[PDB]
From a paper:
Most eukaryotic messenger RNAs (mRNAs) are processed at their 3′ end by the cleavage and polyadenylation specificity factor (CPF/CPSF). CPF mediates the endonucleolytic cleavage of the pre-mRNA and addition of a polyadenosine (poly(A)) tail, which together define the 3′ end of the mature transcript. In the yeast Saccharomyces cerevisiae, CPF is assembled into a 14-subunit (∼850 kDa) complex, which is organized into three enzymatically distinct and interconnected modules: the polymerase, nuclease, and phosphatase modules (Casañal et al., 2017). The nuclease module contains the endonuclease Ysh1, the pseudo-nuclease Cft2, and the multidomain protein Mpe1 (orthologs of human CPSF73, CPSF100, and RBBP6, respectively).
We next determined the impact of an isolated yPIM peptide on complex formation. Substoichiometric amounts of Mpe1 comigrate with the polymerase module in a complex with a synthetic yPIM peptide on size exclusion chromatography (top gel). Including the precleaved CYC1 RNA stabilizes Mpe1 on the complex (middle and bottom gels). In agreement with this, we were able to obtain a cryo-EM map of this complex at a resolution of 2.6 Å that shows that both the Mpe1 PSR and yPIM can bind to the polymerase module simultaneously in the presence of RNA.
Author numbering:
A (entry chain C): 532 to 561
B (entry chain A): 1 to 147, 193 to 441, 496 to 772, 777 to 1357
C (entry chain D): 28 to 422
D (entry chain B): 1 to 94
E (entry chain F): 207 to 223, 240 to 268
Write the structure that this text describes.
RNA sequence: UAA
């Protein structure tokens, strides 16, 4: 009913002066 | 705030398939140009008849074929963008394509890729209809097919299929395997020409059988190694599977590897082959010098035809194809597993019918006939027009003939505005019907067949006869025996009619009993060309051939509409009641009244006509046959309902259901009985050139034209393609753009034979003609540049037209080099003849003062590398094929005859990288300006030699034409010549002074009266100037690596102020200014098919006083952009004091696009409308226009609230139903419908500024 | 007087002619006439990246006073190469002809690192006294910054937007600086013992550091808190760099004779761990082709790697590229010239291989037959290919 | 106007006052030299101020010899140089 | 151990009364005009 | 009038 279509809604990144603000918990080597 | 529209549709054919997608009665030919999927029915004689066309929102990367159970039709596998697959099926009920499923692989590909993905993914289909793989590079996405419709997909790197797979060159499905198996060609260590000495045989080949386990939630694929070959030549790039193995195509070798995985033999195609380097198996040395230097070699493999008892006839043929359109026959005489007599033979083309075609894209066999001797082949080409060829005797007497061609404007490498028509104000003693109009002229092709393509803004008719003051309001031409007698004219203002016998120079016949003292509403032949019927304002008269009155019928009220068929007359009067009379068969002179249904009189009829069609046959008694069209009395009611009935109607009236709302689909149904009339005139008639199909054309009171197509099967239904944006917008419903219908009433006239074309003429201030080619949908074209009041048939295959100034002209359709498809009439101008064959033409300019065209040819001569001195570089080889250099010159072309008037040649290695016709200030004190031709010549040489170039200043001078032929009165005079250090990649004029670019340098020079040229300014560019444009004293210079920069130019104290730079770094292709009112924006095309909008915003906070250009939006195009130009913009309603401009760009795929800047409120309206259309309407292949246009590397840095609008999405608003249109419009704005229609008209007519000039 | 010139203008003319006409980039054949079909380095991706290898020694350069060269840096557009000397001078060298002489006398002590702004508008240079000067593209000294660090500056990297830059020194401290006023922002505290290298992520807000504590750390520029440590190197990590274009890969070299490339997208995943019998001295990512980088060793021996070709050995080794320890590498932004400086007080330029070359992979840079002025003819040759010699020698 | 050569010289851009303030620039390169502005006296010598429609020549362009460092893009003095920062061939130092 | 003024245009050299040119010892100073010009350009509008 |  909503018609098949490729989704497209990317999340905007904050992008302050130091760069893009990202989740820093993805950098632990584990 | 900009909107993107396609001026021209793509013409380069990139893919082709033969299948049964929309029907099983015949094998259709699917053609993909760039984003348009056209279904063709190939005839026996090779003609291509279009059945249905579809336009997609994204670049169609590849197409695949897959069948489905319990259906003869095959689902279409559509690949678009980067790693996207949409399964398409054809809905025969709705006559449209509906998406079955969507598969997205870009995210997984990015997650599994160490480096950035390739721009184009490659699709491969198993010849067992069980699986399909899509690989970008080293990453393969598998799409299993169940034998619900698709199993879950799995994405994996090539390394986990085979351990050694490290750099995939090609992947192909192998044939004659029980299980789906693939062949991988890869190079674990990358090797090129400069790497071969220290790396021998790097290419590896592995055969893996894929065991697919489709589970409910995921899919597991297990691969078993069938064979592995490790020593292969470095230049192998293409795998061509065959019945018993695979042919590996390289630049220098042709390797055959059987399904068991042994190198049986190779063929050394040229002197660069790995001679004695492999030395493992059979070697077939060849001195034919065949080079497959392309990345992927196009080929067709035809399986062996079955014999009478079921054999093979041993006729399995494989044909290769060079970039130069050389067809090669490769034979495989294998008696089994072993193969003998492996060789390649070049097919001889005696008549060189492939001379004008290069860079083939696809080959498809049209008709099989169960024989590999004869072959009909459709081949799409990147430069020439796509050809349908017939191959008769494939032997190791062979002959090839051309059956039909699909017009291709090839790569549009240049764009300019000039005077192709209206060079002379007076033609045949009368003003030019398309006077003071300009048209786009582009350069097309990449070689011998390169030509000039005139993108005509309007159809230019051929005038063979011109009259003055022969008409006032309307004309009619009678044909006693097809002899053009009795050109009756009428004068509505003074109620006068005249005869003007047209046998002899339109003399007054002065005889007969014709009512001269009354306004003639309609007069035509009647009763099988034995009677003449004339309907005046309040009377009906029946005459004979000699105008002797026989019957007179008096009408109480004045008549309005009247239509004639051979036995019947239909007359409508002011009250709205309908009167139909039937002529007496025996002795005429009666005109018996025809009984009408009593339901008809109680409802109001706006217009009516007598019609012949078979659409209502299935609802009539004793009629279930396709042919034998019935006579239908069609009428239009006040509620926009189309009704009709037969002569023996009893009391049943039928109706085209759904036409009041202008739905996508209409069907015939019984009619059972709000006065808001919009439909003004309808008529159902055949259109086309040789394949004439029935079409329902509707003329609305607002001036816009709607067309429906009757399907050859299930003829009681009419369909309109809403996805295809083929029908031009000519008006607006709710009295918007009333100036298009206010002056001259719009009347549609049908002509079954214009020049063999069944066309529809629409009168008005801006006339329109509807022309349908056999291979294209009907198109509405602007007809001339003067108003058309009345049009009547003339002689055989001609019409007579009368304008608003009482001038009569006889017109014929020009069909010699013209293609009446692709949204605009295209004129092919062949500059190269059989005598002097100039190669690819480029950098076309127009000299306004002399009214001439200048183009630069570019011949590809062999390149001889030389050092700083005149010494050949060490590693040369004379007895080997060499790489191609360049050799260019300037051609002076007179548009009057389209012949080269003056030609000058530049030395070896020279390429004219930029030529411009510019107004140069030759005196600063007096501000005198002269139009000079400036050509930027770059010496295209190797990297290791110092870069050099030259610039030439040319003045077009008027000389005495040499006796013998006219139009040779102009010659090129070289004002100034200078060789400079550094390649001259661009030429641009700024404030009467011209700026050229050296190597990493740009210089501004000024010319004085004494023809002295001296540099005055100086600026340093980062890497390499790709394009440069000037707006007054402001300049933009594009860089091959760092975007572009904004530069202001000052005089007296000459300065080059660095106003700003683009923060985004991209390899720009073309530049142009997008002013949009007080502000300033720039349009930059990227090498990644992206066009960027950037603005100069010194007042913005984080712009460093404007030094950082603000990135506004990025818009992904469907092909690379070769050229951009600034064009004045036409305003229909609001004409501000400041001028307006638009950007026009030519694409490599043969398409032309324009960017139209918009104001704030217009942008808001169109943006909300586009969002509503995208979110609520059904996209064709499931493609998201936002994903197609904005999913690029610059999405994050742009303004997410102000993207570039795609006019292709907006035009779907015009194609919606009336109620749907209102619902979409009201979502933002109380008067949003009216203003939205107004600015849609403004965008559509934005390029009509070419219609008025000087 | 004609001389060797390496200009990419004509290849760009050919490339844009091919692109604007829809023609493909034709495969180059092993013959000199096919050199015209060698496209500029920015045009090669995928399997064509092998063409971008700077395997050909094209020029040897040196200054009038032979000083140690601690750092070299190409101009942001690649027009010139800036050579810093141990005496605190700047040597400029035009890329087209490898010719320039005039010095600058930039710093009072040995210049240890230079870095250009992403917008090509500024350069920041440190020295041995902890002094961080700021330069305009015309080399105008606009900001002094005296006591930037107590010890010698080691590395400096600009933020993506260029308003901030991080500096590290022999002192075990990293300082974030606001470029607008030159003021010192928060201090990145940690890193026992000296910190040798630092880098800013090309787009993300992230700092990668290398120190003597055998650690590579990730920092939050906004907060200054260390967010991740790499406990893999067994000795001092000398250099660490992000991939300049996308930044998905972080590579660092250690005195433990091991080079490690980390995929920052997936939990610091170990991609490549190559080891050599000689110490790795400095590294350099390819500016155009990802997955390709060059390692410089203590015995010369330039080593070029490819993530997509070999994860254990270099795809090309130039065993005798320099006569002594190589101190600094610098790829041209255009990607067609590779510049290397070593302790032998010489700057050597490298270009892409030719379709045919008698002396290919036989130059005295590939075999140690460096007799007298073996580079005299290589530097004085007008052409590039040259005829076969004994090894590629000269007088 | 002319479709071949559209008139883009005198266009009402709204950043014209900014271009007059910074760079002392305008969209008319051949504007007359102001008779009030004096390079030595400074920007305060013009009654119309920096937004003067005429031309205010900076003192850098009053120099007699073209700067050799500016030609190479290596002039450390910028607008304060005593040599001409203009591509004037007749004023070149031989 | 003591440097010599090589590229400095002597406009940014001040007599210290470190680095010398001809007998007299000087020191390199900033380009105050350029840095303050940059700060002025960072402000909004002009 | 120079670095
Ligand atoms: Zn003034
Ligand atoms: Zn100067």
């Amino acid at each position: 009913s909503k018609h098949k279509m490729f989704p497209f809604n990317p999340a905007k990144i904050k992008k302050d002066d130091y760069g893009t603000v990202v989740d820093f918990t993805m950098f632990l080597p584990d | 705030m900009n909107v993107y529209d396609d001026v021209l549709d793509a013409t380069v054919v990139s893919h082709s398939l033969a299948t049964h997608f929309t029907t099983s009665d015949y094998e259709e030919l699917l053609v993909v140009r760039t984003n348009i999927l056209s279904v063709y029915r190939p005839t026996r004689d090779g003609k291509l008849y279009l059945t249905d066309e579809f336009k997609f929102h994204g670049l169609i990367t590849d197409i695949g074929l897959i069948p489905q159970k319990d259906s003869p039709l095959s689902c279409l596998l559509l690949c678009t963008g980067v790693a996207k697959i949409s399964i398409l099926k054809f809905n025969t009920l709705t006559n449209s394509i509906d998406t079955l499923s969507l598969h997205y692989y870009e995210g997984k590909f990015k997650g599994k890729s160490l480096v950035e993905l390739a721009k184009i993914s490659t699709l491969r289909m198993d010849p067992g209809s069980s699986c399909a793989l899509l690989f970008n590079n080293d990453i393969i996405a598998f799409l299993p097919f169940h034998v619900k419709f698709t199993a879950p997909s799995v994405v994996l790197v090539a390394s986990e299929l085979y351990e050694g797979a490290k750099n995939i060159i090609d992947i192909q499905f192998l044939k004659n395997f029980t299980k789906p198996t693939i062949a991988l060609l890869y190079q674990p260590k990358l090797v090129w020409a400069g790497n071969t000495t220290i790396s021998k045989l790097p290419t590896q080949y592995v055969i893996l059988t894929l065991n697919i386990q489709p589970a409910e939630s995921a899919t597991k694929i297990e691969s078993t190694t069938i064979a592995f070959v490790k020593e292969l030549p470095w230049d192998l790039h293409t795998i061509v599977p065959v019945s018993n193995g695979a042919i590996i195509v390289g630049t220098n070798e042709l390797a055959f590897l059987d399904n068991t995985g042994v190198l049986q033999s190779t063929v050394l195609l040229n002197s660069f082959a790995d001679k004695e380097l492999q030395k493992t198996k059979i070697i077939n040395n060849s001195s034919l010098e065949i080079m497959f230097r392309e990345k992927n070699t196009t080929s067709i493999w035809i399986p062996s035809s079955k014999s009478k008892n079921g054999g093979s006839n041993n006729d399995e043929t494989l044909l290769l194809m060079d970039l130069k359109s050389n067809i090669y026959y490769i034979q495989m005489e294998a008696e089994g597993r072993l193969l003998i007599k492996f060789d390649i033979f070049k097919l001889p083309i005696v008549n060189d019918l492939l001379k004008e075609n290069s860079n083939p894209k696809c080959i498809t066999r049209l008709n099989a006939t169960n024989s590999n001797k004869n072959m009909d082949l459709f081949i799409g080409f990147g430069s020439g027009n796509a050809l349908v060829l017939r191959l008769n005797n494939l032997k190791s007497p062979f002959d090839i003939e051309l059956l039909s061609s699909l017009r291709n404007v090839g790569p549009i490498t240049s764009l300019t505005v000039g005077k192709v028509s209206s060079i002379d104000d007076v033609v045949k003693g009368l003003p030019n019907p398309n006077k003071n109009e300009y048209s786009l002229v582009a350069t097309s092709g990449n070689g011998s067949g390169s030509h000039l393509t005139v993108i005509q803004t309007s159809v230019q008719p051929e005038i063979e006869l011109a009259l003055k003051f022969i008409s006032i309001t309307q004309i009619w031409n009678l044909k006693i025996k097809g002899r053009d007698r009795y050109l009756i004219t009428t004068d509505s203002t003074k109620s006068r009619s005249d005869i003007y016998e047209s046998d002899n120079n339109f003399k007054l016949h002065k005889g007969g009993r014709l009512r001269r003292d009354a306004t003639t509403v309609y007069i035509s032949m009647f009763g099988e060309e034995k009677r003449i019927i004339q309907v005046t304002t309040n009377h009906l008269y029946l005459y004979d051939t000699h105008f002797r009155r026989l019957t007179t019928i008096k009408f109480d009220y004045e008549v309005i509409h009247v239509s004639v068929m051979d036995p019947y007359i239909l007359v409508t009067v002011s009250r709205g009641d309908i009167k139909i009379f039937e002529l007496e068969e025996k002795n005429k002179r009666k005109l018996l009244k025809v009984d009408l249904p009593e339901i008809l009189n109680e409802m109001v009829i706006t217009s009516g006509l007598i019609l012949k069609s078979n659409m209502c046959n299935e609802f009539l008694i004793g009629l279930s046959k396709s042919q034998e069209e019935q006579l239908l009395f069609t009428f239009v009611t006040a509620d926009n309902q189309i009704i009709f009935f037969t002569k023996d109607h009893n009391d049943r009236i039928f109706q085209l259901n759904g036409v009041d709302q202008l739905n996508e689909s209409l069907y015939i149904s019984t009619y059972q009985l709000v006065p808001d009339p919009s439909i003004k005139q309808v008529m159902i008639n055949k259109l086309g050139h040789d394949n004439k199909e029935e079409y329902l054309t509707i003329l609305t009171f607002g001036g816009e034209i709607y067309q429906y197509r009757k399907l050859p099967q299930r003829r009681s239904r009419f369909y309109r393609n809403v996805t295809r944006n083929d029908l031009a917008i000519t008006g607006a419903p709710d009295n918007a753009y009333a100036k298009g219908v206010s002056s001259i009433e719009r009347i549609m006239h049908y002509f079954p034979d214009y020049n063999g074309y069944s066309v529809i003429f629409v009168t008005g201030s801006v006339p329109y003609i509807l022309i349908k080619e056999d291979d294209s949908t009907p198109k509405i074209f602007k007809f001339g540049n003067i108003p058309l009041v009345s049009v009547t048939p003339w002689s055989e295959r001609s019409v007579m037209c009368v304008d608003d100034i009482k001038n009569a002209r006889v017109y014929t359709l020009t069909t010699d080099n013209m293609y009446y498809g692709n949204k605009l009439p295209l004129k092919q101008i062949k500059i190269s003849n059989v005598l002097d064959d100039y190669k690819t033409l480029q950098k076309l300019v127009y000299h306004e003062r002399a009214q001439l065209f200048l183009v630069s040819y570019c011949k590809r001569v062999p390149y001889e590398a030389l050092g700083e001195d005149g010494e050949k570089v060490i590693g040369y080889d004379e007895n080997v094929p060499h790489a191609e250099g360049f050799q260019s010159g300037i051609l002076l072309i007179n548009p009057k005859s389209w012949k080269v008037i003056d030609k000058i040649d530049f030395p070896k290695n020279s390429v004219v990288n930029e030529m411009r016709s510019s107004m140069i200030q030759i005196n600063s004190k007096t501000k005198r300006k002269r139009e000079y031709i400036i050509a930027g010549v770059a010496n295209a040489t190797t990297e290791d030699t110092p870069p050099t170039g030259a610039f030439h200043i040319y003045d077009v001078i008027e000389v005495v034409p040499e006796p013998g032929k006219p139009d040779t009165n102009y010659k090129l005079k070289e004002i100034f010549q200078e060789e400079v250090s550094g390649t001259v990649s661009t030429v641009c004029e700024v404030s009467g002074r011209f700026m050229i670019s050296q190597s990493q340098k740009v210089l501004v020079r000024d010319i004085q009266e004494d023809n002295s040229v001296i540099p005055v300014a100086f600026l340093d560019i980062p890497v390499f100037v790709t394009d440069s444009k000037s707006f007054g004293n402001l300049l933009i210079i594009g860089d091959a690596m760092q975007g572009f920069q904004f530069i202001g130019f000052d005089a007296e104290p000459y300065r080059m102020i660095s106003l700003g730079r683009s923060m985004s770094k991209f390899q720009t292709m073309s530049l142009e200014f997008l002013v949009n009112g007080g502000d300033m924006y720039f349009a930059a095309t990227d090498a990644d098919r992206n066009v960027h909008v950037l603005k100069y915003a010194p007042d913005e906070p984080n712009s460093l006083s404007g030094q950082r250009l603000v990135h506004c939006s990025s818009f992904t195009l469907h092909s690379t952009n070769s050229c951009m130009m600034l064009l004045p913009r036409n305003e229909e309603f609001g004409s501000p004091q400041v001028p307006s401009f638009q950007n026009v760009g030519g694409q490599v795929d043969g398409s032309v696009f324009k960017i139209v800047p918009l104001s704030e409120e217009k942008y808001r309206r169109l943006y909300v409308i586009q969002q509503q259309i995208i979110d609520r309407e059904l996209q064709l292949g499931g493609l998201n226009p936002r994903m197609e246009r904005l999913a690029n590397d610059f999405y994050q840095m742009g303004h997410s609230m102000r993207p570039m609008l795609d006019f292709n999405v907006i035009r779907r608003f015009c194609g919606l139903a009336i109620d749907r249109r209102k619902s979409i419009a009201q979502k933002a704005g109380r008067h949003a419908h009216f203003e939205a229609w107004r600015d849609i008209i403004n965008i559509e007519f934005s390029m009509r500024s070419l219609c008025q000039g000087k | 007087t004609q001389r060797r010139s390496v200009d990419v203008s004509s290849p760009y003319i050919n490339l844009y002619y091919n692109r604007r006409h829809g023609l493909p980039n034709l495969v180059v054949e092993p013959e000199t006439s096919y050199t015209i079909d060698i496209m500029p380095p920015n045009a090669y991706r995928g399997r064509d990246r092998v063409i971008n290898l700077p395997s050909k020694f094209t020029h040897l350069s040196s200054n009038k006073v032979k000083h140690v060269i601690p750092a070299i840096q190409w101009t942001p557009e690649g027009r010139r190469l800036v050579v810093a000397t141990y005496s605190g001078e700047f040597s400029l060298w035009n890329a087209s002809s490898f010719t320039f002489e005039t010095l600058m006398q930039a710093h009072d002590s040995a210049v240890t690192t230079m870095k250009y702004s992403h917008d090509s508008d500024w350069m920041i240079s440190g020295d041995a006294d902890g002094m961080i000067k700021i330069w305009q593209p015309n080399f105008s000294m606009v900001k002094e910054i005296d006591a930037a660090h107590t010890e010698s500056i080691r590395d400096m990297a600009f933020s993506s937007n260029d308003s901030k830059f991080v500096t590290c020194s022999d002192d075990n401290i990293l300082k974030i600086w606001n470029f607008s006023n030159g003021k010192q922002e928060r201090v990145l505290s940690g890193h026992h013992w000296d910190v040798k290298s630092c880098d800013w992520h090309p787009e993300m807000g992230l700092i990668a550091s290398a120190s003597k504590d055998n650690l590579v750390k990730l920092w939050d520029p906004r907060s200054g808190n260390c967010i991740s440590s790499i406990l893999k190197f067994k000795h001092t990590v000398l250099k660490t760099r992000f991939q300049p274009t996308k930044g998905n890969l972080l590579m660092a070299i250690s005195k433990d004779k091991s080079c490690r490339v980390f995929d920052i997208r997936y939990s610091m995943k170990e991609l490549m761990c190559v080891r050599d019998e000689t110490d790795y001295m400095t590294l350099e990512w390819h500016p155009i082709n990802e997955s390709m980088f060059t390692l410089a060793c203590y015995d010369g021996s330039l080593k070029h790697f490819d993530l997509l070709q070999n994860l254990n050995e270099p795809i090309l080794t130039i065993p005798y590229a320099h006569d002594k320890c190589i101190t600094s590498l610098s790829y041209n932004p255009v990607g067609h010239i590779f510049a290397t400086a070593a302790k032998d007080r010489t700057i050597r330029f490298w270009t892409r291989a030719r379709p045919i070359d008698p002396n290919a992979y036989d130059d005295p840079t590939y075999n140690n037959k460096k007799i007298n002025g073996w580079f005299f003819g290589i530097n004085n040759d007008i052409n590039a290919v040259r005829e076969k010699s004994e090894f590629g020698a000269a007088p | 106007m002319s479709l071949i050569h559209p008139d883009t010289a005198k266009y009402p851009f709204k950043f014209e006052p900014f271009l007059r303030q910074e760079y002392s620039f305008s969209l008319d390169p051949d504007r007359p030299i102001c008779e009030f502005y004096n390079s030595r006296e400074g920007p305060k010598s013009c009654p119309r101020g920096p937004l003067c429609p005429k031309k205010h020549v900076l003192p850098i362009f009053q120099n007699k010899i073209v700067c050799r460092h500016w030609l190479r893009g290596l002039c450390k003095k910028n607008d304060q140089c005593e040599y001409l920062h203009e591509y004037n061939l007749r004023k070149m130092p031989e | 151990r003591i440097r010599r003024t090589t590229g400095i245009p002597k406009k940014f050299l001040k007599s210290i009364e470190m680095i010398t040119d001809e007998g007299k010892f000087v020191v390199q100073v900033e380009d105050k005009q350029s840095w303050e010009d940059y700060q002025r350009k960072r402000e909004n509008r002009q």
